[PDB]
Design a protein around this ligand. Sequence first.
Ligand SMILES: Cc1[nH]nc2c1[C@](c1cc(-c3ccc(S(=O)(=O)Cc4ccccc4)cc3)cc(C(F)(F)F)c1)(C(C)C)C(C#N)=C(N)O2
Ligand SMILES: Cc1[nH]nc2c1[C@](c1cc(-c3ccc(S(=O)(=O)Cc4ccccc4)cc3)cc(C(F)(F)F)c1)(C(C)C)C(C#N)=C(N)O2
Ligand SMILES: Cc1ncc(COP(=O)(O)O)c(CNCC(=O)O)c1O
Ligand SMILES: Cc1ncc(COP(=O)(O)O)c(CNCC(=O)O)c1O
Ligand SMILES: [Cl-]
Lengths: 442, 442
Amino acid sequence: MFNNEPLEQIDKELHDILADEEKRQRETINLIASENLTNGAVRECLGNRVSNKYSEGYPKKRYYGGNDFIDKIEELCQKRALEAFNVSDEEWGVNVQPLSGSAANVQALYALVGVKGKIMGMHLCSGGHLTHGFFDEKKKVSITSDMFESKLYKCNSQGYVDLDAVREMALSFKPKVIICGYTSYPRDIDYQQFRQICDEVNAYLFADISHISSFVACNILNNPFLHADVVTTTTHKILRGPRSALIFFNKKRNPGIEQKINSAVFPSFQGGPHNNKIAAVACQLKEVHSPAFKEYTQQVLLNSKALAKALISKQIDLVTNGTDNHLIVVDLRKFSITGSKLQETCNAINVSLNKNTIPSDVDAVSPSGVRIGTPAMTTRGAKEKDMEFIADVLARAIKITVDLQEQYGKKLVDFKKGLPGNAQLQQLKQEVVTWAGALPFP
Amino acid sequence: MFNNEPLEQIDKELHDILADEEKRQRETINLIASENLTNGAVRECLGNRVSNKYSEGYPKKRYYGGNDFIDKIEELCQKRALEAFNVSDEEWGVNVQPLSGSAANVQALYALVGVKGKIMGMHLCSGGHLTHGFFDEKKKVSITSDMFESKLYKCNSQGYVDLDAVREMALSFKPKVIICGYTSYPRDIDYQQFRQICDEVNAYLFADISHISSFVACNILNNPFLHADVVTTTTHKILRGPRSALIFFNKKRNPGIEQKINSAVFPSFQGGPHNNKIAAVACQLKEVHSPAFKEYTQQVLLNSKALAKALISKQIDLVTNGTDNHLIVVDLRKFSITGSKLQETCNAINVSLNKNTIPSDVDAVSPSGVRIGTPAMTTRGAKEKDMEFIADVLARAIKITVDLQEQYGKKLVDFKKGLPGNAQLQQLKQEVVTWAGALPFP
Ligand SMILES: Cc1[nH]nc2c1[C@](c1cc(-c3ccc(S(=O)(=O)Cc4ccccc4)cc3)cc(C(F)(F)F)c1)(C(C)C)C(C#N)=C(N)O2
Ligand SMILES: Cc1[nH]nc2c1[C@](c1cc(-c3ccc(S(=O)(=O)Cc4ccccc4)cc3)cc(C(F)(F)F)c1)(C(C)C)C(C#N)=C(N)O2
Ligand SMILES: Cc1ncc(COP(=O)(O)O)c(CNCC(=O)O)c1O
Ligand SMILES: Cc1ncc(COP(=O)(O)O)c(CNCC(=O)O)c1O
Ligand SMILES: [Cl-]
């Protein structure tokens, strides 16, 4: 007693928008550092009938039966995850049920410390995530600042984690957890030194590697598995999976942690798992471990270096003056424009990027930079050579943005009035569309 | 720089299990009250490239641009929700970002009361959900019992909500929120009398209609929108949508609650929305408002009534002696068999159901009932006349279960040993498989 007419017929309104969305993605130069493009196989899993099944609990300890094939999937996923991140299943466990990065981080945080627990994280403005204890004078913005008691450490004026500052805070504040691994941090982390500080205060070491996950897995960057008690990652960014999260726990360093984490995810926070997610993640973790994906991941770094170097060749300042990974943060202060202004300008030319704070910023209201990343364009087949054009396009966007701020004023209201119809943008959008439109698209 | 081979070729290991899962579902008499079968249109959305997009925030108040098509989808979803539940967008607001029902309930609860806040709900044993403040003396099982201060009311010995007890507890406990709407409650709710109790103590009225949402929308059951400040629902049960949740808030009864709820979902708890979910919910919500879906929903109730009547005709006791909705709880005490045993016996004959507590149950570990629902089999084309056969199959399972407990004993390790090979089960599975396998299957 159901309707099996295809999407186009059943909901023409929705279907059109979706095709328009597809067309925008195909014709956009996507620099969002957190974004990527999923292959068909990952999308076949996400629309699989497996999502019909309620399987609260864990494999072999399910609340309901008929979960034989679901158990096989969730176990095949856990295996592939530990394999991908080069950890022994005797030493490390993994939970594959968290629905997304923010859920996963809160769940893990809860497991280790619980309500009222003391946590430490990098401040949003310096490059941390909201889920790392972010708050404001005015409001506890994240549940992580409110269900826990959080303290926030800043990077120095050059954009770098200052470990001396971390230690000063950890010895006076005395938290049960310190988080490292970040949302807009263009450099590698000294996990060993975090681990050293954690031991000094008897604090847990938590590493959120969502942005750099592929780098850790392919052994291109520092390995926090060597030192961390917990490692979290999303699966949708550089990893190129669906929208989900993984929580890794160090069984060997702390026994009784497996139950704590597993019970945090369920039943403390979530109910039924999303089996289409789990299948989809499994399908990408196969690909993560293949040597072709190591190729891709290397290409992401190659591209990120070339882009920084090309941006520096056009006299554009970068936070930390370069990158060790997939992401760059442009300091726009010398041009007397805001990140918000350039974001607007870049959307008018089909360039997705996001405004980002820099160390000199005192408020998140007017961030002075933008953040770009290479994983999505690397997925679409761009090489080091193709990075000069992108750097060139961003330099032209910066110029046009200065031109429009001169003509229409610095008020954001007024600036946007300038943007529609501008001949330079239309031309620049057209070039962006022509080059972007022809790149391979999964 | 990506692999575009289909799922079968890329990952044959995974694809076989999914085909096996597909086969099991097609060949199962699925009585899980919370399960359903989604159509091809809903699954085409879930596999859509819209999930590629990071769109943190709300429509027109997005952190990043390039969200013009994403904004149209999230707005078309919100609209269709309010239309589907027959509320005016002037009086009611809806949040479409919660990833699942348990996320939605915590998010809404935190909005209304915050950390340390007082809440009331129905006990899990009595038919409530985990997210309604469920705990044990041993442990704060749900975050809703730990991040909030929770008190739990009990249903009476006949399985009904006892409003006198709710009042007695409400005036003494003085909560800020009282929750009704339940996971395994076979009767309609008195929302008016809940409102009156809530008004008496200056508490919010929270209605969780995840199990009954179709009935509320289609006007077959009591409307909680007339009396509730907050209404939560999942989209994947009787609603027949993807795995997601909705939060409805009554703007007129409490202005400035829209911001409380929206801020709760993001950035308090979640990060980026899952736009494939959002698109999938939109697609189902169009179907919800059609009159053909009203026809289906009526049928779920016709079937549920007929099933109860047939079960009573075979001298089987139901909690509350019947049903007003899509679900039944079978009291098995007169047969001296547990729900766990009958779940095991039913998995062996490809009958999906779950064990469930009854009012005489003191502990959750040995529940004395099973819970069944009609939504899924109604989706597969079963009519009133097909319910006698389902009741006949469950009766035979009950007798087989008594026979096996006779031969191998009451201990569960021993009981299951009897299960494989039994002539009657193989016979019963065969008929289950024959009838199940030929029914329509989206
Ligand atoms: C969206 C998101 N998620 N996780 C994140 C972010 C970033 C971010 C986050 C915010 C942000 C700031 C505050 C709040 S708030 O307290 O809820 C309300 C408020 C917003 C604006 C002004 C005044 C009050 C919510 C989000 C602002 C910006 C910025 F670019 F606008 F500055 C960037 C970027 C990756 C986009 C960010 C940075 N940088 C970091 N590190 O992590
Ligand atoms: C799974 C789930 N989710 N939401 C729910 C349930 C039900 C339920 C839930 C439980 C349940 C009980 C305790 C816990 S616990 O304390 O977190 C962990 C624990 C593990 C092993 C041994 C003891 C405790 C978690 C779930 C038990 C049963 C039962 F049938 F076994 F009794 C049923 C059914 C729909 C399945 C339930 C009922 N009835 C209600 N109303 O809602
Ligand atoms: C360190 C970190 N953790 C978690 C998340 C996200 O979790 P959700 O899947 O719940 O969004 C992000 C992405 N932050 C936004 C970005 O980089 O664009 C992140 O950077
Ligand atoms: C009233 C209620 N609320 C919330 C949820 C679940 O949210 P999730 O999507 O996070 O599981 C359920 C499902 N309860 C299990 C069942 O009925 O089978 C429920 O019955
Ligand atoms: Cl999904």
